[PDB]
Design a protein around this nucleic acid. Structure first.
Ligand SMILES: Nc1ncnc2c1ncn2[C@@H]1O[C@H](COP(=O)(O)OP(=O)(O)O)[C@@H](O)[C@H]1O
Lengths: 78, 415, 116
DNA sequence: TTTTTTTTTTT
């Protein structure tokens, strides 16, 4: 469907609202790139990393819990 | 058996009459008496229909300088409660043990599974070990333990309310820093507690006699030359025959406070009331359904719930913020309190500070402190009561060893 | 603290046992207090005079600002010369006091107590 | 397959 991008990034953080970029990016980490093996066996990454800097205002713990819950495999650690 | 309890609960004023039934000896602390009474009966462990598993246990965490009857508050709750256990922090989970008789290597119960429905009294919370710390937090927000030990892989149940008391670092709690500094505890652990009472101390002349006389007298009648009957049967009864309900008239009475206070706290160096405080407030909502048999949420005990949930937050604050937030809210929330205690709050300080003056120049621990009147109504103008004679008649300040003179204006303080 | 009190009745009882009596009298408690009084000593420092005038001012500076606006920095300094210089008289001691007051008031800065 | 005491390598 034409607007396939935003339909997901809209329904991945119902409670917390504001600045969908911090929700735009999280949409990709759930899919990830692809693992390549060059002729040299020198494989490449297939995952991404994200940092959400800022004061601890508990607005982010919700997001952590969500991304952990809606993941094929996932663990939230202190 | 209930026919008395009917009218005794219908007194409409069972709160005061029950508060001074726990802590039978220890004088003062009608503040923390309130919180611990809230904890004892508990609240309501409702099951949210969205599969979120909110808990119905009130956990308390005392703290304060040594010598303030914390341990006695633990030991008396050992007695009054039922199915209670006890431990120090200097055995928390089930462990493999070679049986004395059978001589088989069985599994024995720890100290958080023996309170699977009652209370768990932790002492010397600070002295816990890293394994003990990583094991205590799991049971707070999950209330269920797994044991993949040498014995066998099991997953048991643990539904207990935790009552513990930590210590201040440096041998004294000093309220320049936040409470999260003098406690010496991992930060995501303090969040797992509902109430945060801070015990403190001060050299106060009029209370020296009050505490001395009490101890001395308790040493006069112990040597070889609501009573304890109503409230035990009452924690047995009121535990059972109530199931508090939840309407939706209070659902908007609170947000008007949150929207303000969140800004008020975030403005300065602090984190405002967050959802894990709203949960505690809504848990203590029903904490009075057990005392009144009320069981219906009303805009009355919401004045109490919000009051308590801020009581346990203004204290754990900074030096000038613990008073700036007071000047805002303690006057904002319209504390459903005595009009008289707010009178004492003034002249108590006005005589204590005057003694502090008359010590740093003379040094003599004088006998009769003398303070003229005019100062008091100056500050009473801020709360707008200006009532002294109806307080002069009230015997709620003679015990505090004060006086007044119509022609001399002196608030003469004896001791 | 409190635990010193529960430890004064004990010493009086142990004093009464000694004289084979069956009750405590003032004669016993007075001595059981003198002993517990000599027990605790006073900490020392190479300075008590320089702390009297640390809190004789911040009792003249907290109540004076929470109601009115503030105080003059060139007048609160003299208030000390305007309360305690009113009795002792030596015409030299004025500036000898002013110099130490200026030094200590520059000192109050690094404790972060009396700032301007 | 448990305490308690004593020596030495290791995080
Ligand atoms: N207000 C008080 N009323 C009665 N007893 C008190 C009071 N304050 C202190 N005590 C005494 O202090 C003891 C409690 O000390 P505790 O709080 O256990 O010290 P710590 O906290 O260092 O373990 C009690 O046995 C009690 O006799």
């Amino acid at each position: 469907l034409p607007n396939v991008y935003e339909v997901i990034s809209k329904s991945i953080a119902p409670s917390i609202f504001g600045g969908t970029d911090m929700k735009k990016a999280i949409a990709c980490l759930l899919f990830g790139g692809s693992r390549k093996r060059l002729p040299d066996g020198l494989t490449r990454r297939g995952d991404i990393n994200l940092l959400m800097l800022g004061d601890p205002g508990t607005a982010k713990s919700q997001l952590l819990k969500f991304v952990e819950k809606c993941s094929p495999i996932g663990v939230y650690t202190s | 058996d209930v026919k008395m309890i009917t009218s005794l609960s219908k007194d409409q004023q069972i709160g005061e009459k029950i508060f001074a039934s726990i802590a039978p000896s220890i004088y003062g602390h009608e503040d923390i008496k309130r919180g611990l009474a809230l904890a004892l009966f508990g609240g309501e462990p409702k099951n949210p229909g969205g599969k979120h598993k909110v808990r119905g246990d009130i956990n308390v965490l005392l703290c304060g300088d040594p010598g303030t009857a914390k341990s006695q508050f633990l030991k008396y709750i050992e007695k009054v409660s039922s199915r209670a256990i006890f431990t120090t922090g200097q055995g928390l989970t089930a462990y493999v043990q070679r049986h004395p008789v059978s001589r088989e290597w069985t599994l024995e119960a720890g100290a958080l599974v023996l309170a699977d429905r009652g209370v768990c009294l932790i002492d010397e919370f600070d002295k816990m070990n890293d394994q003990d710390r990583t094991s205590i937090h799991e049971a707070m927000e999950q209330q269920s333990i797994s044991i993949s030990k040498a014995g066998i892989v099991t997953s048991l149940q643990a539904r207990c309310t935790v009552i513990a008391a930590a210590n201040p670092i440096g041998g004294r709690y000093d309220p320049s820093l936040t409470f999260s500094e003098n406690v010496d505890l991992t930060e995501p652990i303090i969040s797992r507690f509902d109430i945060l009472c801070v015990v403190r101390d001060t050299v106060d002349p009029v209370q020296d006699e009050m505490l001395a006389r009490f101890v001395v007298g308790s040493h006069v009648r112990h040597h070889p030359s609501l009573p304890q009957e109503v409230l035990k049967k009452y924690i047995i009864y009121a535990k059972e025959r109530v199931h508090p309900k939840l309407n939706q008239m209070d659902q908007d009475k609170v947000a008007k406070m949150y929207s303000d206070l969140r800004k008020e706290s975030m403005a300065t160096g602090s984190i405002p009331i967050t959802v894990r405080h709203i949960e505690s407030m809504i848990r203590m909502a029903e904490a009075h359904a057990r005392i009144h048999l009320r069981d219906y949420v009303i805009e009355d005990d919401v004045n109490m719930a919000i009051r308590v949930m801020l009581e346990s937050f203004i204290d754990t604050q900074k030096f000038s913020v613990m008073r700036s937030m007071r000047k805002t809210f303690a006057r904002y929330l319209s504390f459903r309190r005595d009009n008289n205690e707010l009178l004492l709050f003034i002249l108590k300080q006005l005589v204590a500070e005057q003694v502090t003056y008359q010590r740093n120049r003379f040094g003599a621990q004088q006998d009769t402190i003398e303070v003229p009147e005019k100062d008091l109504v100056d500050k009473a103008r801020q709360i707008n009561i200006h009532n002294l004679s109806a307080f002069y008649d009230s015997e709620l300040f003679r015990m505090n060893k004060f006086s007044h003179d119509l022609k001399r204006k002196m608030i003469l303080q004896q001791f | 603290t409190v635990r010193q009190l529960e430890s004064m009745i004990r010493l009086s009882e142990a004093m009464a046992r000694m004289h084979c009596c069956d009750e405590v009298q003032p004669k016993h408690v007075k001595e059981a207090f003198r002993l517990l009084n000599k027990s605790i000593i006073r900490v020392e420092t190479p300075e008590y005079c320089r702390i009297s005038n640390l809190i004789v001012l911040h009792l003249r500076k907290v109540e004076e600002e929470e109601d009115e606006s503030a105080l003059k920095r060139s007048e609160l300094v003299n208030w000390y010369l305007k309360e305690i210089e009113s009795e002792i008289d030596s015409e030299e001691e004025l500036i000898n006091k002013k110099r130490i007051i200026e030094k200590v008031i520059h000192r109050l800065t690094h404790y972060d107590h009396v700032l301007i």
